[PDB]
């Protein structure tokens, strides 16, 4: 908006942003696979993490 | 007319001169005077008129009697 | 620029940048520069007004 | 020591604890002064501002005033005859009665006693004493002096002082447009009041130095005459 700029989102520090995004990955993605799974499932797991 | 009243439990005290009643062991049912206090659980008792040798004994082995 | 003045020196509670580092020589050159900037900006707004009426479609709220 | 204990709060300041050797130094300086100077007065300076003490200490140069722990001074002079330092000196360590200073000097006894009779400077009305006045904080915007210079002559009290005025001083204060303000006049103390801590902290806060200070001097030890004269100028 052109006359005011109240609406910028909160920009966290670097380590805080690190914690935020990394923990969102560890929470909003599944976190259990086993080495006995098909390598396709292991791959899909880690590609999803990335 | 208006004094403080506090109900004091009159516990027998493990004190030098308290006489105990040995409830088990070779001195069963014999009196013995407490001679010194060793620690919280053990004391040195002596019961010479009843035939108790001077010894260090647990307090769970004897029963405090009202006599001092 | 970060070698000479840092972000902390540029702005903040510990800011040290108190004067503009490229202050103009005098007031009148500042004024004529400002007039040129305003003319350029307003001409830019005019020329971009030739591309839009999609902004006005936002007044009628379709996409 | 077993757990759940108060954590000692330390900070990063420059000055360090003095220790035993500073007391040894005070002890030895008192000893040498006793050997050197003649007259040794014991001065009671229980609550003394340092500029006052430094002016007193510089209103003469050829003498020396020594302070320190009362116990270390009584030790240096000696508790009793069995441990004293000069003949009949223990009658001085029996006369060290608080914040005590030792005034080793060669000035005539008359000069010193008249000076300590006639020296006075104003101080804050320190607590636990009879109040030397009565100031009522006026109603309205409280100013720095609380009315002791007029309102147009004084500046408003800092808004940041209001939490202290309201919590530590118990004065019912408001903030009206950034100015501390009481709706009704508030009296702090009356003449003759045995001051509490908060009364004397309020009086110091407004810079009310209506009271005065002078040195309470008890007996002095005359070195060569080896006796003590119980002067007492309270």
């Amino acid at each position: 908006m052109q006359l005011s700029w109240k609406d910028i989102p909160t920009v966290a520090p670097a380590n805080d942003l690190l914690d935020i995004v990394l923990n969102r990955t560890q929470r909003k993605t599944p976190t259990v696979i086993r080495p006995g799974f098909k390598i396709t499932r292991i791959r899909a797991f880690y590609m999803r993490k990335v | 007319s208006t004094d403080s009243i506090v109900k004091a439990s009159n516990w027998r005290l493990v004190e030098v001169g308290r006489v105990v009643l040995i409830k088990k062991g070779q001195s069963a049912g014999k009196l013995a005077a407490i001679v010194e206090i060793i620690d919280q659980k053990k004391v040195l008792i002596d019961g010479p008129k009843a035939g108790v040798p001077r010894q260090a004994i647990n307090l769970g082995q004897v029963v405090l009697t009202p006599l001092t | 620029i970060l070698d000479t003045e840092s972000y902390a020196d540029a702005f903040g509670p510990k800011a040290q940048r108190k004067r503009p580092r490229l202050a103009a020589s005098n007031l009148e050159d500042l004024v004529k520069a400002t007039n040129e900037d305003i003319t350029k900006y307003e001409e830019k707004q005019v020329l971009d007004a030739t591309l839009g009426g999609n902004q006005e479609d936002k007044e009628n709220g379709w996409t | 020591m077993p757990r759940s204990k108060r954590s000692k709060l330390v900070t990063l300041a420059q000055t360090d604890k003095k220790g035993r050797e500073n007391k040894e130094r005070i002890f030895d300086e008192v000893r040498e002064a006793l050997d050197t100077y003649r007259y040794v007065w014991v001065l009671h300076l229980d609550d003394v501002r340092t500029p006052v003490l430094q002016e007193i200490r510089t209103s003469w140069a050829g003498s020396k005033l020594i302070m320190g722990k009362r116990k270390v001074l009584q030790k240096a002079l000696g508790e009793k005859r069995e441990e004293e330092y000069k003949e009949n000196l223990y009658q001085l360590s029996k006369l060290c009665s608080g914040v005590t200073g030792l005034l080793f000097t060669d000035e005539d006894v008359n000069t010193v006693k008249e000076y300590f009779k006639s020296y006075v400077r104003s101080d804050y009305s320190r607590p636990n004493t009879k109040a030397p006045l009565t100031f009522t904080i006026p109603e309205g915007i409280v100013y720095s002096r609380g009315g002791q210079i007029p309102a147009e002559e004084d500046v408003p009290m800092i808004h940041s002082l209001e939490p202290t005025m309201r919590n530590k001083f118990e004065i019912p204060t408001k903030i009206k447009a950034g100015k501390i303000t009481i709706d009704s006049p508030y009296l702090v103390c009356t003449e003759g009041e045995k001051l509490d801590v908060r009364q004397a902290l309020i009086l110091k806060q407004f810079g009310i130095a209506a009271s005065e200070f002078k040195v309470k001097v008890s007996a002095y030890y005359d070195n060569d005459s080896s006796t003590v004269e119980s002067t007492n100028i309270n």
Binding site: - | - | - | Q54, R57, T58, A61
Partner: protein, 126 residues
């Protein structure tokens, strides 16, 4: 009553054009000055201060090479308002102030004149 200020080198518009006289004996050296108002008119005065007098013995920086004949002088202007049994003490405050400023006294750093006095190598008229 008295009002003190340092920002020089209550009727504001009048005293400013009256205290210029007392200052500007100092070539733009910042000096504490006082005011002695009687009813509504003030009189200007320059207060003897260590830092301001050290500068006149010479952004900007101070290197000095001041000679010790004047440090004892500057100290001598401040004996009445200092806690010094000797002029050696007061010249030691002045040498401390000079070391704060950044100058050098008799062509070396002002602090060695402290232990110069302490070792007896330097002596002070008294």
């Amino acid at each position: 009553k008295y009002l003190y200020l340092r920002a020089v080198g209550l009727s504001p518009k009048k005293v400013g054009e009256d205290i210029a006289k007392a200052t500007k004996e100092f070539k733009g050296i910042k000096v504490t000055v006082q005011l002695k108002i009687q009813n509504r008119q003030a009189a200007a005065s320059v207060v003897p201060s260590a830092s301001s007098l050290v500068i006149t013995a010479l952004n900007v920086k101070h290197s000095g090479n001041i000679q010790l004949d004047e440090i004892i002088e500057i100290a001598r202007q401040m004996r009445d308002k200092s806690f010094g049994r000797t002029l050696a003490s007061v010249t030691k405050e002045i040498l401390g102030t000079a070391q704060s400023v950044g100058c050098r006294v008799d062509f070396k750093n002002p602090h060695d004149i402290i232990e110069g006095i302490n070792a007896g190598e330097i002596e002070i008229p008294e």
